[PDB]
C-alpha cells in the first residue's frame, strides 16, 4: 500500500472468505523478522481459519522489542496492546524508502502521555501527541519499520480462510487419516443418524473428542468413531512343554485381524 496508518490511529482491515497463501509471504526474503506466537511459523498452511484481521501501522525500530504480547513499554501501555493469550504473527521489516521520507514523516503520530493503561485491541482517539524524527547515526532502531499484525482466532466457528491445498474424495467403513478444516485425527467415518442444527459444525463428546462433523462443502453429516483397537494377550503353556502359542485379541471380534 501507498500510505499506512499511525501507531496513534491504526488500520483494521477485516478479512474473510478468501483462500490464503502464507507461504509466498514466508519464502520471500523481504522481511527483518517473522515471529508467529502460538502457531508454528511454517505450519501456517495447514490450519483453516475463521477470521483474519490485518492490522498495519509504523513504529520506532527499537519498539519491536515492545511489540511482543505481555511485554511492557510505552507503546504497550499507552498506544497498542496485545493480550497475554494472543495467537498469530507479527511481522516487521525495515522502511528506509517505504515509510521513511522527508517532510519528516509527521503524518504518522505517537501518543506518549496517557493517564492509564489499555485494553487489548483498542484504538484511542501537555499535549500528548508527538511524531518522531527518523535519524539513524543514533539508533537504527530510531528508524521506522513496516509492522503488521496477523491476529488469528482458533476454530470455534464456520472456518473460511485457508491455503492452497487440494481436497480429495472421501470414503467410509475404513480407518483413515482425516482432515476437516485443520482438525487432524484417525478413525472410521459413517453416516449420521443424529439430526444436526444448521449453525454448528462440531460434535464433541464428554471425553473432549470429536464424534460428528459436517463436510465444509457438502451438507452431509458424518459420525466419527475411533477405529478399533485392543489389548494383545498370549496364551501358552510353559516353555518346558513346547513352543506352540495361542493369540487372544481383547474386546474386538475376528473379522478385522
Amino acid at each position, epitope marked *: 500500500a501507498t500510505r499506512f496508518a499511525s501507531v496513534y490511529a491504526w488500520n483494521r482491515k477485516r478479512i474473510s472468505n478468501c483462500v490464503a497463501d502464507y507461504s509466498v509471504l514466508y519464502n520471500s*526474503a523481504s522481511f527483518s523478522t517473522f515471529k508467529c506466537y502460538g502457531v508454528s511459523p511454517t505450519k501456517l498452511n495447514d490450519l483453516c481459519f475463521t477470521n483474519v484481521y490485518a492490522d498495519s501501522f509504523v513504529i520506532r525500530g527499537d519498539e519491536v522489542r515492545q511489540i511482543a504480547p505481555g511485554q511492557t513499554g510505552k507503546i504497550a501501555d499507552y498506544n497498542y496492546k496485545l493480550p497475554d493469550d494472543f495467537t498469530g504473527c507479527v511481522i516487521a521489516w*525495515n522502511s*528506509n524508502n517505504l515509510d*521513511s521520507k522527508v*517532510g519528516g514523516n509527521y503524518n504518522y503520530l505517537y501518543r506518549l502521555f496517557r493517564k492509564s493503561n489499555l485494553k487489548p485491541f483498542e484504538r484511542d482517539i501537555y499535549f500528548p501527541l508527538q511524531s518522531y524524527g*527518523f*535519524q*539513524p*547515526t543514533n539508533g*537504527v532502531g530510531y528508524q521506522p519499520y513496516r509492522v503488521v499484525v496477523l491476529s488469528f482466532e482458533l476454530l470455534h466457528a464456520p472456518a473460511t480462510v485457508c491455503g492452497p491445498k487440494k481436497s480429495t474424495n472421501l470414503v467410509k467403513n475404513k480407518c483413515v487419516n482425516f482432515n476437516f478444516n485443520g482438525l487432524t485425527g484417525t478413525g472410521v467415518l459413517t453416516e449420521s443418524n443424529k439430526k444436526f442444527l444448521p449453525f454448528q459444525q462440531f460434535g464433541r463428546d464428554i471425553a473432549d473428542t470429536t464424534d460428528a462433523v459436517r463436510d465444509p462443502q457438502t451438507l452431509e453429516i458424518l459420525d466419527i468413531t475411533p477405529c478399533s483397537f485392543g489389548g494383545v494377550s498370549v496364551i501358552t503353556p510353559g516353555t518346558n512343554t513346547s513352543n506352540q502359542v495361542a493369540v487372544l485379541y481383547q474386546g474386538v471380534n475376528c473379522t478385522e485381524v
Partner: antibody
Amino acid sequence: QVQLVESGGGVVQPGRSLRLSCAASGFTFSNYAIHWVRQAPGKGLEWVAVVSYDGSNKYYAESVKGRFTISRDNSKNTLSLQMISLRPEDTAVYYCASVADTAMVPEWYFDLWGRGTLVTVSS
Amino acid sequence: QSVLTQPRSVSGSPGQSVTISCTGTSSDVGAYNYVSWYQQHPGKAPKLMIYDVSARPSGVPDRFSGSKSGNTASLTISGLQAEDEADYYCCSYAGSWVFGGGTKLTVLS
C-alpha cells in the same frame, strides 16, 4: 565519517569495456540505495543507475540500458558498475551517489555525494 | 521532459533575492511532490538544499526556499552571499530522475 570513494576511472578507447566501483564507510550501506550520476566537464547532471540489496530491482536511464550493469555487495559494503560498449558521449565525471543516516532524506534523493572519478572514452 | 527547463544564468545583487524556475511537465513535476534542488560548486560534488518543495534538510540555511504550482518549481534564495555562487540543479522523481538544464548563479561583485 559517512564517506563514498569511487574507483575504476581512467582513460579508455571506444568499443572497449570498463568496471567502476565505490566503497562505503560511516553508514550502514545495506539499508540505503546508491546511484550513479554522471556529469560531463562543464555540463549538467545525468543519472545512470541503481541497484537493490537483493539484486533484483535495477533501473537504468535511456542512454544506459543494454550496456551498463550495476551490482553491489552488502557484506563488503562496496559495489560494482560493469560497463560495456563505451562511446565518447559517456565521457563524464562519475559519482557514486547515496544518502547518509543523519538526514531524514531518503535514498531516492541525493544528499551524500562522492568525490568522483574521471572516465574518458576517446581515441 | 527529457531535460528540465531552467534559466541558464541568474544575476542578482548581493543581499537581495533571486527566483530560479524549474519548468517541467505534468508527468515530471505535477505528478508527485518530489522535486529537489542541488547546489554544485565547481571542482566539487553537488549538495542538496531543498526537498519536497516546501522544506529544507539539516545544515541548510533558511535562505534557501522553494515554491511550486503546477509544473514549475521556483527556488528562492534571499540574502545572496558570495558562497552561493555556483551551479544550480533541480531534479524530480516520479518514475525516473530527470535533472535540470543548469543554472549558474552570479553574485555581482
